[PDB]
Amino acid sequence: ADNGLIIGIDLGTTNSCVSVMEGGRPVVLENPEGKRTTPSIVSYKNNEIIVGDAAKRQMVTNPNTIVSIKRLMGTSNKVKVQNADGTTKELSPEQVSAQILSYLKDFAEKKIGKKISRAVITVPAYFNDAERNATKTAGKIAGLNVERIINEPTAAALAYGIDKASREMKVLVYDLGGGTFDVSLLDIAEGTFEVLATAGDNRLGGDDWDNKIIEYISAYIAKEHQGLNLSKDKMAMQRLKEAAERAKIELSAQLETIISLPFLTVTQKGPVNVELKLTRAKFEELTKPLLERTRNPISDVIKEAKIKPEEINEILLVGGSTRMPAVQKLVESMVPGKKPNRSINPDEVVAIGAAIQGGVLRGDLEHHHHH
Ligand SMILES: Nc1ncnc2c1ncn2[C@@H]1O[C@H](COP(=O)(O)OP(=O)(O)O)[C@@H](O)[C@H]1O
Numbered sequence: 001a002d003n004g005l006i007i008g009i010d011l012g013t014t015n016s017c018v019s020v021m022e023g024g025r026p027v028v029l030e031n032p033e034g035k036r037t038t039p040s041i042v043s044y045k046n047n048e049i050i051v052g053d054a055a056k057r058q059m060v061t062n063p064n065t066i067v068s069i070k071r072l073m074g075t076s077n078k079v080k081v082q083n084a085d086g087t088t089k090e091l092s093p094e095q096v097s098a099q100i101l102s103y104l105k106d107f108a109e110k111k112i113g114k115k116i117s118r119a120v121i122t123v124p125a126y127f128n129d130a131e132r133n134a135t136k137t138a139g140k141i142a143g144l145n146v147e148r149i150i151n152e153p154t155a156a157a158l159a160y161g162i163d164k165a166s167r168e169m170k171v172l173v174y175d176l177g178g179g180t181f182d183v184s185l186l187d188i189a190e191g192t193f194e195v196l197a198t199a200g201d202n203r204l205g206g207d208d209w210d211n212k213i214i215e216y217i218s219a220y221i222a223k224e225h226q227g228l229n230l231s232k233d234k235m236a237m238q239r240l241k242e243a244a245e246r247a248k249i250e251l252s253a254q255l256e257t258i259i260s261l262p263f264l265t266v267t268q269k270g271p272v273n274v275e276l277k278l279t280r281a282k283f284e285e286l287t288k289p290l291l292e293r294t295r296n297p298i299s300d301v302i303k304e305a306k307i308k309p310e311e312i313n314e315i316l317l318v319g320g321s322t323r324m325p326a327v328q329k330l331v332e333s334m335v336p337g338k339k340p341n342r343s344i345n346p347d348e349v350v351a352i353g354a355a356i357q358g359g360v361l362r363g364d365l366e367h368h369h370h371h
């Protein structure tokens with residue numbers, strides 16, 4: 001009743017993910033579109049509210065589609081959407097976040113076959129009391145008793161079982177998501193976590209790598225066409241965003257990718273088309289400034305914690321963007337001798353950790369199997 005399942009939720013800037021403990025193993029639950037992560041995006045059409053993939057498909061084209069709401073959590077800023085009758089609805093960050101949490105809860109209940117009323121939700125380590133409390137409030141609005149707020153790098157460490165280490169460990173977490181870059185140095189001793197230092201940039205993420213591909217496509221276009229004003233064509237812009245992210249993702253697995261955009265826009269001489277082969281080497285050249293900006297935050301946490309690099313016992317790669325080969329190579333170069341951990345899907349690892357934390361809070365060793 002009050003002692004039922006405690007689901008784990010990663011409420012991310014770009015994507016969200018829900019996991020639950022099942023027979024002593026964390027399981028990641030698929031949304032109704034069959035996907036293990038859900039875009040953190042919400043569309044409003046009066047009281048019809050759409051969350052996730054369907055909303056992402058209109059993020060450029062629909063003025064009542066809300067993105068990056070996490071950035072406002074803990075402030076008294078509002079976002080505005082327009083009702084059918086022309087009046088304006090003001091929404092708090094808590095209210096919009098709550099729609100994402102409600103979507104996850106609803107599909108999780110149908111998968112599990114039970115009502116759910118308890119959760120652990122993750123936040124960035126730098127969140128203050130107001131930012132944490134905003135996240136608790138979003139949970140409450142969605143019908144979830146938020147049993148604990150835990151830090152994202154700590155959740156990742158729980159997923160890997162590092163709290164069960166026999167010796168004291170220093171752990172470097174390099175977390176490159178869609179919008180933000182977080183480096184954390186954790187001390188794990190006696191099954192408890194201490195954040196020794198944090199660094200990074202909350203305006204650097206995978207979106208920036210996409211945007212460099214968009215900038216490149218715009219250059220290719222400019223070799224044949226001037227005076228397009230491409231930004232005013234919202235369909236063109238939505239297609240460019242989708243094509244860039246797709247191309248980037250393919251280049252994590254392959255050495256080349258083809259960007260194909262027939263009838264992208266029109267000029268007085270007919271259609272503008274794109275057919276462009278992008279190699280991994282060219283992609284890496286274009287995005288080198290972005291990659292290099294991730295380097296100094298690693299040495300920042302080493303400096304602040306007053307450790308030598310050899311004192312780092314384990315490295316965790318978190319965030320979808322760490323699937324990029326050049327990102328993995330950079331991290332290896334900064335902690336010589338150590339093989340980074342990426343065996344747990346880096347887009348799911350935070351939610352998995354939250355689900356483990358939920359199991360522990362609920363109790364019952366048959367249920368969490370924490371040894
Ligand atoms: N295979 C891949 N290669 C490169 N980038 C990827 C890959 N898979 C996901 N990404 C990127 O990861 C970013 C999202 O990170 P994620 O950790 O899932 O969310 P959040 O930023 O909300 O924590 C996006 O920029 C996405 O394109």
Ligand SMILES: [Mg+2]
Pocket residue numbers: 012013152177319350
């Ligand atoms: Mg994240």
